[PDB]
Symmetry: D2
Subunit: 115 residues, 4 copies
Amino acid sequence: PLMVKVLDAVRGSPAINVAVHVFRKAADDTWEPFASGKTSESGELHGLTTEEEFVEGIYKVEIDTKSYWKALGISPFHEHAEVVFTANDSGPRRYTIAALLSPYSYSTTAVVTNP
Amino acid sequence: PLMVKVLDAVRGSPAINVAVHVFRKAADDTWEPFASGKTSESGELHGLTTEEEFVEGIYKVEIDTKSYWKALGISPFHEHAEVVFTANDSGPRRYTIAALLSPYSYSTTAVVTNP
Amino acid sequence: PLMVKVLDAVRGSPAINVAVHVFRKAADDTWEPFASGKTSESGELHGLTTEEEFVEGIYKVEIDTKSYWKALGISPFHEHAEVVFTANDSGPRRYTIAALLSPYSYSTTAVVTNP
Amino acid sequence: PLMVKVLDAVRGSPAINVAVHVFRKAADDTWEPFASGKTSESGELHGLTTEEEFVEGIYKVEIDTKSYWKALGISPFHEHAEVVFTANDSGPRRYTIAALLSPYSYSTTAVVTNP
Ligand SMILES: CN1C(N)=NC(=O)/C1=C/c1cc(Br)c(O)c(Br)c1
Ligand SMILES: CN1C(N)=NC(=O)/C1=C/c1cc(Br)c(O)c(Br)c1
Ligand SMILES: CN1C(N)=NC(=O)/C1=C/c1cc(Br)c(O)c(Br)c1
Ligand SMILES: CN1C(N)=NC(=O)/C1=C/c1cc(Br)c(O)c(Br)c1
Ligand SMILES: CN1C(N)=NC(=O)/C1=C/c1cc(Br)c(O)c(Br)c1
Ligand SMILES: CN1C(N)=NC(=O)/C1=C/c1cc(Br)c(O)c(Br)c1
């Protein structure tokens, strides 16, 4: 139900080995750890959560962009990219959180499907 | 070797049934028809060409965005989105041409892989 | 030295009356309030800080995109757009933080100039 | 009434000295030259046309992105960025055509205002 995809707009490629941390806003309004991983050779991170565990709520996806650009010898602007959204608030959905990265810019979109 | 993917940034979904026409710049410098199709339920168009036929050159991918937005009752700015690029000019590659659409904006990127 | 500009990709217009909150990372590694305001009729927010006060550090620009869309007869995907970056690490610069908004996507860029 | 602005997502700067060519679709359905220029140090191109001359029609803005990148020690993906749109179909408007450039991606938006 939750997948993250990261692309590199400088090289025209998947962004490989990018670290991702996912949080859920708790009953008390603080950010509780939820899931993490690194992108694959296809720039994708699967297997973050299960349908059962991915209940309605506010989630934060942090994508560690800065370390990615440094490893490539390219000077970056942002510390990371943070995507904060409400999930499943009309019922269970499958989410792809995509990020397209440049050193001084990024784009993020959600593709939300109903099985 | 050539795939086109189209996303809708208003609805957060694949852009389905979007018409695509692909041209190749000919020896004479004019735009010759090459391939066409419509996006699927996943917003993807596969099977445009074969490795054999997809030789080096300048290609144009025209995505008929205007008809897409009209069918949805949303007022659009652009007539279409046109992506013009040189392909295979360091050797054969697999290309994904992605377009993320809004009524008054679009983003396009290429994901270029080497099998 | 710090300006925020916000555009609406649905309407093709400035995003007016968008609330913005700016934080700076403190010596103790928490987010200290730094500046705030709302975008004007041109989608711009000037007058956030002064050259003297805008020293080197990690800054967070929170753009309250959800309320913008909730006001217009949308229900968007994101809670807000956050832009986190290190400022003035090579000396004083002027920063424009731009954001282009759609209901299920946004893009953000920085324009960094040396006066 | 018509302005073009071009930004560089790699450097976080205006894209300076970018060539732009503007065409209008003629009664006979071919592309007639209309206006041209190069972006300034602010990445902007003003003075393309006048209110009197900029009547309703289909316009094409060609932004010569390849030469921009070829000058800088890149070899980009796209030959150019083309933006094709109907102007003034509900009456006279002022248009800013913005483009944010990366080597393998670009985004383009319109800001359309009613003076
Ligand atoms: C379905 N639904 C409606 N109509 N309004 C909601 O807030 C809602 C939430 C929801 C329901 C289930 Br069952 C589920 O597994 C997940 Br996750 C979310
Ligand atoms: C995500 N994205 C953004 N933010 N700008 C884009 O052009 C874009 C494209 C995209 C490309 C592929 Br390929 C893909 O599988 C998915 Br999902 C999205
Ligand atoms: C490989 N190569 C190099 N080094 N410079 C080129 O222009 C080039 C082009 C090319 C070669 C093959 Br065989 C092919 O199937 C495709 Br289509 C493109
Ligand atoms: C100039 N400089 C260099 N070379 N490395 C730095 O970290 C740095 C920081 C800086 C200096 C001044 Br004076 C200033 O007003 C601001 Br604001 C930032
Ligand atoms: C105003 N108007 C309406 N209502 N429908 C149109 O097609 C239209 C076009 C138009 C009118 C003027 Br007078 C003008 O200077 C420019 Br230029 C465009
Ligand atoms: C144009 N644009 C795109 N396509 N993606 C962006 O983030 C973006 C930002 C933009 C930034 C400034 Br500064 C500006 O004056 C204008 Br007019 C637009």
